[model samples]
Each structure stands twice: as structure tokens, then as C-alpha cells.
Target chain A: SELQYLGQIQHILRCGVRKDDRTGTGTLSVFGMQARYSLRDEFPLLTTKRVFWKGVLEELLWFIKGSTNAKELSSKGVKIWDANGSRDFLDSLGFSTREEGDLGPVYGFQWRHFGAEYRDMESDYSGQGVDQLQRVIDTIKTNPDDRRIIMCAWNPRDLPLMALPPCHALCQFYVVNSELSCQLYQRSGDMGLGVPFNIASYALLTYMIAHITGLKPGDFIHTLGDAHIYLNHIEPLKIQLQREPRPFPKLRILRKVEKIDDFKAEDFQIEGYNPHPT
Target chain B: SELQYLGQIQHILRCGVRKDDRTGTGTLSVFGMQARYSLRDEFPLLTTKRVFWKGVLEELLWFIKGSTNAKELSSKGVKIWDANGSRDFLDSLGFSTREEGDLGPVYGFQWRHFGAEYRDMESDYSGQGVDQLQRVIDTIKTNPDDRRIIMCAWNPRDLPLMALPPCHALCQFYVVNSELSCQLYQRSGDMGLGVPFNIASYALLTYMIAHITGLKPGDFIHTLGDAHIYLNHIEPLKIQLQREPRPFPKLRILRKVEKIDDFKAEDFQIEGYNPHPT
Candidate 1:
């Protein structure tokens, strides 16, 4: 039922940034689980203590929309990452970062109305940094023999510039045994605590991309960098381990918005879930 | 500490076949916790209720030797896979069974004398494998520009002929900033049962490979295809979840053997462990 949080967070931030990593001061906190069930199976639970899934959902949507700022997230009353991010980034570009102001397009803008590329950019300009979904699909349908059909999200020089470096990075779709399978290599993750977010995020992405690519999501492999359970959240993690988990729900985004910004909470739907109170 | 069962079982099978999807009666069992913590941080535990470090060392050496027959494994009480695997396909006649005896070389054979190509009549009768450790290090030192510098233990064509197909199937190595990082992708695993096997095996492999490659062992990301938790092992998993994990000691390999076959149980050592029974 808390997957509602994913949708809710997606709704609030409209795909922006959330940077609340502190534990002692904030109303919200995250814990890590040492469990190893990747997105290939179970979804992660907040398990340490009861959490409001609404905030996490909105926060994730903010991340997915590829937002590197937290101003849009501030409007939702989450105020979690408000301190760590710089909102003046948009204003410095001549557009104010305020809600009604001329905020420069961020993640959603980059994901959809991308520059230096087009609808068929996969045909040639992969290095141009545009939405790679189409190219990923076209390759499987046409050149199943080509092994170099990988989309890279890591640009070493650009990493330090972002407020938070991308986590769900470098996903490649492979057709093995004539079935479409995806392997996601996440560079950094806190498996004991942050895995639930990692799990649902990739699985949903896998479902979306696989549906678009004309192949079923065979496997979602998540590789992690710093996969430790942070020392601070250990107690909460124990609480979560003490709780029983509910069945996971399927996430459905109804509006097929071509542009990332165009899609809203109204576009999404959830079914067949029985989640425990966070 | 019960992980010594692996060695004990290895002593019994001497050699056998694990068929397709035979991961504990269609449910996760026989394994739990398959993490590859680096040697700089922790060492694997071999002591169990009945099995101990000696058995673990011997079993590891025997597997590296790729001895599928009873003679090599039985003496150590580790009887896991099918013996007479070659007889199933008549490989002695230079005909490898892609169907039944797809088992050309088990773990030991592949680790030492990595034959490259399966002797397929349709395809070239080329070499299919390699000295796995060497291949891993070679990829690390030279193929820094490549991605799929992977080594596989699962030979699908021989599954029918093998007493058991490899569990921890294949691993891909990536050297980031000259740090020897590894990501192992398991095909089908019993998260509750066989995960421990995976945790130790991959860690040992990673440690050994790092030393030989002349790079410090970095992160070992263990990704899985079918990572399941068997119902039967759920209670055991819970017990483990409750017990606090003791500090892992430094795993010290006794020998600096260049060839996989040259390695033996005497070539390994673990120091400074303070563990309690799980």
C-alpha cells in the first residue's frame, strides 16, 4: 500500500531532487537492510519504523524526473533535501527557480524535450545525451546481432556537477534465447537500507522499458558500490526486520506522456497490493 | 558455522549432476546470504555445526582442480555433483554432449585448463573456456576498455549430463580506478540455502584473483537472476538474521600458485576471527 508513496512522491516533486540524508534532526529518515533479494524478487520495506510512503514516492518521482534540485520538492512540505541543493541554479541561467517563475527545464526536460538529438537519435547520436529509450527498443527489433547496443548514463566530468549523482545508472537491454532481459548496474547503493527504493525503481523501470521494447523484462540485476547498512539507521532496520511484509502492487502509469514533465500523478495507477503500515 | 556442510557434501558426491531449475524442489533452500565482502574488510567462515575450515579448504581446492569423479571429492566427504559425467556424453571419444553431458569440465577443469569452445560439430571444434583465474586477471590488466570480460562456470549444453549444473554460474570483472572490483551474476540460487556457498566461493575467487592481478580487491557485487528464499529455510534465515554477525577475519591464501591445479588446501589460511554459532 505504501507504493502509493512512490506515486505520491512522483506527484509532489514532479521529478525533482530530495537530499535529506541526515538522521538525528529530520522528521524523515531511511534505514538499510542487509538482505540480498535484488529487484529480481522482493520489494524493500522501510521496516525500521513506520514511515509515510507518500514522501518516499514523491522523492523518487523527483529523482526519476532527473531533477537535481529540491525547490519543486519543497512545495510538497517534505522539506527533506531543502538544505543540500542549490535552487539558484535555474535563476543563474536567467530563469527564476520559483514555482511560477521561468525555471529552466531539468531532468524531465532532459529526459523528454532533449536537445542535440531527436526522436530517432538512436540512429546515430547516442553520445549527444538524449532520451535513450527508443534506441534501446529499435536495436532489439532490428539489429539483434549487435552487442554494442548499450546506453551509458555515466559522464565522468558531469558527475560532480549534479546535486546528487544518478543512482539507477547504465541499464542495457539484452535479448537472450530470443527473450528480452535487462541488467541494471547501479554504482552506489545501501543494500540494507536503500534497497527497497532501488528494487521498486528498477523493476518499474524494467516493466516500462520492456513493454516499450517489445520484450518481457527477463532479469533486473542491480550491482552496488557502497552496499553497507549505515551505522545510524541500524535500530530502525531492526524494527523493520521485526515486521511482516505485504504483497507488492503493480504500478501503472496511464497517460503515455511523451515528455517527462507532461506526466502527472493522474497518469499512474496501482493494483493488487497489501502493504503493511510503514 | 554450518557452512562446512558444503565440504561434507562435496566429500560425498565426489561428482554428480544438478539439473535445470533443481534449486531445492522449485523453492529457495540450501543457501542463505551470498555476499562477497572484500578481504580488506572481512573473511569467510568455514566452521559449522559439523563442518570446519579444513573441509572448506579441501573442498575449495578440489573444485579448483575440477575433479567431478568420486575419487577426488569423496576423500574429503564432499559429494555434490555427478561423477561419470563424461560417460554420459562419451566425451572420451571427443564428442561432448550439448544436451545430456553438456558437462565438459566442472568448476575445477574450467578454473585450471579453460578449454575455449564446446566441441560442436555445427560450429568449429574450437576451445570454449580458459584458465579462469588468468583470464580474469588478463581482462583486468589489459581489457580495461571492455565490459564483458566475464568467466562462466555454467555450461548449459552439459546440464543433462552433469550431476549438477554450476550454481554460481558466471562473474564479470571491472577495474575502476585500478581497484579490482567484481560483479558476480548467479543464474538460479537458493537464497535461503546456497547463498552462503556463493558468499564464500565468490569472495575466495575475488581475493585470489585480486592478488594475482596485482590490484587491491575492491567491491564484489553479487547480482542474481533467480534469487529465491525457500520456505523450508525461512526459519533458519530468521535465526541468522537475529544472530549478530561476528567480525570477519582476514582470509589468507597459503600459496601463490599461478596455475589453478597447483593450489591446495594447505595454501589457505584465515586469521583473527571471533565468531559465534548461528
Candidate 2:
């Protein structure tokens, strides 16, 4: 069940130290925490509260598609990156920025074209840096036993140019007995707001990557640094924690998606996801 | 005092699963584990077994100096990386040869100059990549509370060029209440041999960094990805567990070395380090 997920918040509640953060909101922060979810048991969508599943799917697919524009996600009715795409965040990075929904080399951009030099959004980035996603997929298909099959989104060279430094810093894919597992090292996790999204997102990422590569989804090991809960969210989290956890949802792919890039929102269906009200 | 270190090995012994690994030698492995040592209490050199204290000091100094050549360490009578500097490991990365002690662009190199385009042993790497160590020190003095003050050695593009890919992949330094704490995310830890060295090395690093920046040595949070014990080392570990921990050692910095680069093997002294047989 989600006792593991809830247990972490409980752990943070007990042991977390008070710390100030970049958001100007104070946090009860714990430095190192990891949560493991077996994709075999459940899809790991939080049963304690209703997670916005559609947005998670869309953002993940957008990343897989290697998109940097929020308009692309916005067109798909995903407003997650809309705030980040504002003129303020764009202008803060440098001059002559904010072309509508340009996220300025965020997660998806780094996933697809990491270490590539940044000009404007429309500049040619053909032969710039490593295609980490391509290499990751290729390795998962080819030598799956290699320990170094890792995808790092933290490009030190490109961090200054990014709209937001990556919270999900790096992840390594492991395969054993024809089962695929992923270990994600996220540098900062907003426990109440962000971690719930992060856990589901990476698990979904693992399942999709596993599906196309002809491997069963194994475990999603979420390793977090600076895991924290905001002062404001404590009351809401406590209320949410009071409710009993519902059974986890199981996901089934409607059809065999041969390549990872071909996945759409409708390709996967969630079953038995009855949770407490949002 | 060493219970935190022993507790993890006990955990792996009880709960670790037998897993095949890249090194041909199999391991009883666990996915995620973290150990925290408060350097304020004592210097965390393993007192259960006779740890080579001088080698640890030399290696730490070598890394801080940002020297990739094992010859530099060997000059100081540290032969820890002797095997790694062999012609075999050198040629494996497609190098023409080795100068008997050239460890190609490994941990220290990546620490000092990350993302530098690496060539063979003698190539000059003057003004390339981020000077992460330099930035880290400067940031600690200027803004200690900044969460983004990170030093990463795991360069994805340069992993192939490295003689041995970094096992201590990346580390983050945190400052809270005028004290410095370090959290290391090691990709793979040979718990038997490497982790002992790693724990001391990083703690020493944190201590030195803290000392120079005028802060107290706080905590060394060791986070491991694949934490494993080789089959043969179990007996040795059990013997270690059976012994009682001595009152921990106190490290005295004999000289006020102004910068991180100024310290050498002789500048520090360990008091009352009584340990069991190896």
C-alpha cells in the first residue's frame, strides 16, 4: 500500500529540521530519503489522494518527445509548465527571451539534447550534445546488464541557461531476469506538492520504457535530497494523512507501442483507482 | 560510535538479495541505503578493522589538489590506485599507453574541471569545463545556505573517456547553522573494500572544507545506490561486528593551512585511534 509513501512524510514530520528555501516558504526538511515502489504490485498513483493522472502522462510523453515548449503541452491541455513559461522566468535567465511557451532547456530539453549550446528557442541544435534518451533506450534494449546505463539531466554547463535547475537530477536503469528497474536521484523533492507527482512520473517513465523494451516493470526506487514539506502544506497533509489509503491503481497498456516516442495519453488505462476526494 | 556503519552491513546481510553484477564477482545487494556520521563526535575511520590511515589522508589530498595522475599519489607513497593505473585499464579506454601511473580523468579531474574534453595522458586541459570545487568553496564563503552549491563528478559525456567511471558519482555540500554537512550519492559501493575508504575520504573532505571556510564539521551522509557485500567478505564483516567500538579518534589539524590546496599528509594528527586486527 501507500504506507511507504505516507510513512516518509511521517518520518519528515518527526525528524525534519526547520529550514528556509528558495521559494521564500520555510520547510521542515530532511536531507536524504528514498522510497521504493514495485510497479508489479501497483502503478504507484497515490491512493491517499487523487493525483492528476492526465497531466502526469502528458508531461512525461512531452519529455519523451523531447519538447521544450510549454505551448506543446498547453495544446494538450497540460498547464504544469505554464507558470514557468511566463515572461519573468524567461527574462530572469537573460535577454531576448520568452517566445510564448519556451521553457528554455528544462527537463525534456536536457533529456533529448543535453549539453547542447543554447541560443534562442528556434536555433539549430542538430550536432551539439549527447542524445541521452536515445542512448538510454538503446542500452536498455542492447546491453541491459551494464551498470552505467544512467541518464543524467543535471548538465552543469547548461544549468545557468535553464529556466529551472533540474529537481530530478539523475537516474540509472537496471535490468535483471528480464525485469526493468530504475533508481532516480532527485536533488530536491517538495514532499507535499512535488514528490507525489515525481514518484508517479518516474514510475510511469519506467513502465513505458520497460514496455517498449520487452521487459516487465520492476521497481521504481526514488532517492531524494532536500526532501521537505512547506509550512503551509502541513495542515492539508495532516488532513490527507487521516484518511485510510485506498488500493493502488494498476495500469494496462491498451496496445503494444513498439517505440518509446510513439506513446500517447490514450495508450494506457488505469484500473481500480478509487481514492479519497482531492 | 561505529554502529551506524556496522548497522548497514547487518541490514544487507539480513535482507540483501543475490544479484549478478558487472564486475564478474557476484554480490548480495540492496538498492538504496544511507549512513550518517557526525564528525563532531569523532573522526569516522573504521576502528573495527585496521584501516590504512595514511593512505586515506594522501588520497583525500590528491583529490583536493585535482591531480588525475596516480604518479602524484605514488610520489607521496600512496599505492591505492596502483592496480587501476595499469596498462590494461589505460588501454581499455582506447589510450595508446599509460605512464605507469596515469589514471585518466577520474574523480579528482572531474571534480576540478567537469565536462572538459578529455584526450590522452599528456593533453593540456587548461580552460575547459566548470571549476566545481572552486565554485563550491567560493559559494560556501559567500552564500552557505544556497541549495544549488553542488559539486558533481559524474560527467555523462566524459564517462567513456574515463579509465574507471566514478563510483562516488556525485556529492552535494550543505551548510546549516554555520556547520557543513556533505551528502554523497555513490552509484555503486563495494561495501567490503571501497565504502570504508569512501566514508573516511568524504568526511575528511567535508572536514577540510569546513575548516578552511571557518565552519564546524557536521555530518557525512553516505547514500549508496547498489550497496553490496561480496560473499567472501561476510566473515570479515561478522568479525568486525563482534568487536566493541572504542572511544572514537579526535583529529587535530596541527597547522592553520589557509587554503584547501595548502594541506599535505603531515599537517594533521589522529589521537587515540585504537582498532582491532584486520
Candidate 3:
């Protein structure tokens, strides 16, 4: 279960080539890797190390609401995006004219309104661009056999306007025998810090969607382009790799959520989560 | 090397689930499959069945020219896209307004002018939207360490306007130790008929880009979303899978090509390709 994550870490360490990155940090990089996690009767909460569960939930909820304002998430005491939304980071990326918390048209905006013109975080975009998430749900319920059920956040036109380009670029959903699965294509992955969190977040997303659609959760397939371990994270990851994996926890959704937007943190519960100390 | 493709076929036949599709043809399908083909010394043109090399070459050239007209490739005696660009098909898709042969901002248009307003097939689009191909080459030359060297064709804004949405959606290029590799994320793959051609096409693409960028060709990693074999083609594939895979051929560049746009059809020579008769 969690060994998949650890195995990737080990693989990168053993075979990955050293490459420098935009952050001025070097990395042990591999080109392409694919891992499948079964979401059947269990949630992949990653028992090797504790993932920030609350942050994952809050951030995803924020994304569902299509809020480009990072301050909205930060206000809930989840500061995951606070650094990227900082005025200094914005200016560094030449978004000097933008407000401190305005993360341009990032994941949320792209998901809800794909082609909509962005004015600011406060602009009303009630029915602007394509609502891909809703389309995905509709397709799952109406035409589960359709092969083109995709949700993408990589807008080339909007890339220059954003604080950062998307790492998890696109995802496609599949359904068979009343089971729903998701495959995510991430262009770049920071294997140490980001990937574990990514795994939990998308698995949670699949569970939520499956719940709403009344389908059993199938699998979460993560495909990476540049999967890498940052040089500084090497030693810590070595320690992490030594730890044996525990059984994955089960995600218990308390409420029968009919709508995609109606999911709250309180409506979900994690059971049998026994992670190693950081 | 070609066993990667054959193994996938075998796996699908054994474990794939039956699913209905857009074409009214059913398929035994699996989600999230990845195969890597080495482009180091030998090409990955399948020996089990002869992939149409000429079509792969001419079609890629047409895409490189940023021509969205299917007739352009058809005029060169490569009619692989003829059915998709047919007037009847266009009308069936409710594109009666669009001229026959215009594949509205499909692969070529998105590769070159991504966000540009697509008028028609014959319109002049010299310097319109983002030139992702050029950007990839520039990034390789300037900053080979950059993780975001991507070329995408899955435009959500342009999806509704097209005759068919992109199947091979997006691809990322990676470089390490003077070796360049490419990973393609195809949203859907027709495993029997389409995937072999796709393998050769993208491997050729990686070779071409590597030639231009002065990097050794490393690997072409093909990732699929809905990987399926059409029910009608299953028996043929099963028969084909029983045959042994021969050694892969080599792709030789006849002359040194300076510009990405300058490479002609005669410049590529495929050596030692022997396949089972169709």
C-alpha cells in the first residue's frame, strides 16, 4: 500500500540522474513513473508518515469553490498556499500589479471556469467557462462508458497570469461495473514533500466523487513526468524509506452527499490511521 | 523492446473489463497503463505487425507545419485522417458550418498556436498563439534543467469547436546527462489498431526533437488512460500476440537538420524493419 510511495523514493534514489531545477535546488530525477493505489474499501492516507489531513481537505474544498483568493484558505489556518500567494512571490513572478492573495487563475478557476477571462479573485464568474468537474460527474452518471471524461487545469493562455503553472496538469475518470477510477497526469512532482500529499488529496477526491455518483471507488493512478527527489530531502527520505508501511486507513463518509459542492470536512472521517512520527 | 507493447495487449486480453464506446463498438478496457520504449540505439516500430511508417512520417511533418487541414496529409497519399475529416462525419458532429478538411485547431494548431483564434484550415497563422514546440527547443538549449518543458494539445476551450477531441492529449520532455526523453499521456488508446502507430509516431517525435536539440534520444514513455482493444479486433490481436517479437529497427537521420521546420521526409531513413505480413 504505502510501499508504493516508498518504493518510488527508493527507485529515484538508486537510478535517478542528478539535475538542477528552477528552485536552485538539485534533484535526483527520473523521467516517467506510474503507480496505482486501490481505493477499494480503503483510503490511501499514507501510513509511513503523517500527511497533513486537515490541509488536504481544506485545500480541496477551496478548489471546489473555485476561489482564486489564497487568503480564503489561509484564513482557515491552512497556510499551504500562503507562501505562493505572498506579495514577494507574486512580484518575483512579475505579477506585481496583482493583490497579495490573488493567485490568478490557478486550479480552482480552471476547474470551474476553464476559458473564462480573469479580472481578479473578487470578480463574479457565475457562468463563465466550462465547468469540467460538473461535466465529469454528469458524464459518470449518464455515460460512464465515455472515454473522454477529462478535467484539465493546464491553460497555456492563462499560464503567464498565474502564480505557478499546474503540476498535476490533467486527470481522466473511468467507470466499469459500478466502480469509478481516476488517472492523474502530473507534469512534475516533488517526490518527498508534495507527492504523499498529492496521493491523499486525489484519492480523497475520487472517494468524494464516487460517493456523489453512487459508485464504488476503484483506483487512483498517478502518472508522473519528471518524478524527482530534491537533494536536500535525500537524507530525510532515506529515514522514511527505512520505516515499514502500515495498513492504509479507511475513509468513512458520514453523509450521503448528493452534490459535489456540498462536501464538508465534518462530513468525512478517517479510521485506522496509524502513521509514524515525523 | 517491442515486448512492452505485446505484454500490454496480453495483459488487457486477460484482465480487461467489457465497456461500450462512442463508436458503438465495444471494447475490453483497462485504465492507467504505461509502456516505455528505448530510443537509445533502436527505434520501437513493432515487428509483430507492420506499422505504416510513411503515414507516421508525413502526418508528423504536417503537424509540424501547424496545418489543421486533413486534406493536406490526404493529398500526400496519406489518408489516415480521411474518415475523421469527411464531410459526412463533419455534418454528423454538427459541424456543417465548418469546411470539409478542417480539423479545427487539433494537434498541429495546438502545438504551434495554442490559444490563437482558429478561423479555418486555409487561414494564415504565421505567428499567432504560443509556439510550444519552439518553446521546448528553446528551453532545452537555455535551461535544460527546467521541469516544465511541456507541449499540450488538449485545449478545453477549443474542444467543443473540434471535429474530435485529442486522444494523445499532452506530452512532457525531460533531459538528463545529455539525453532527452519524452513522456506522452494519451487520454484514450485503441490498443489494437492505433497504439502501434502511436508508439512509432511519438518515438519519432522524440528522435526529431533530440536531433534538433543535440541530445541523445533516451526513452519514449507512453501512458494511456482508457487503453482498450475493440471487440472485433480481439481475435486478430490474440493471434498476433502468440507470435514472437523481432528486434526493433533503427532510425537514421540522413542529413544534419538545423531548424525544426527544415526536416523533410527524405531526411529520415528507417533501417532493418521486418514485420509479419498483414
- The numbered model that scores best in DockQ is 3
lDDT of 3 by residue, B1-278 (tens): 88888899988899999998987699999999999999999999999999999999999999899988999999988999988888999888888888899878899999999988899999988789988989999999888888888998988888877778998788999999999999999989999878999889989998999999999999999999999999999999998998888888899999999888998999999999988888
The interface RMSD values of the models, given in order, are 13.3, 1.6, 0.8
lDDT tens digits by residue: candidate 3, A194-246? 88888888999899999999999999999999999999999899998998899
Best by lDDT: 3
Query: In candidate 2, residue A239 scores what lDDT?
Result: 81
**Residue B157 CA displacement from its true place in model 2, Å:** 0.7
Docking class of 2: medium
Q: Which has the greatest TM-score?
A: 3
Model 1 TM-score relative to the real fold: 0.45
Residue A16 lDDT, candidate 3, scale 0-100 = 90
Candidate 3 chain A, poorest ten consecutive residues by summed lDDT: A1-10
Q: Which runs in model 3 stand beyond 4 Å of their true positions?
A: none
Chain A only: give the TM-score of model 2.
0.95
The alpha-carbon lDDT assigned to residue A53 of candidate 2 equals: 83
- In order, what are the TM-scores of chain A for the candidates? 0.58, 0.95, 0.98
lDDT of 1 by residue, B121-172 (tens): 1333223445565655676677542343456554332333344446555565
Two-way lDDT contest, 1 vs 3, winner: 3
Q: Give the TM-score of candidate 3.
A: 0.98
Single out the weakest 10-residue window by summed lDDT for candidate 3 chain B.
B155-164
Runs in model 1 lying further than 4 Å from the true structure: A1-221, A224-278, B1-36, B46-56, B82-104, B109-129, B143-147, B158-160, B176-178
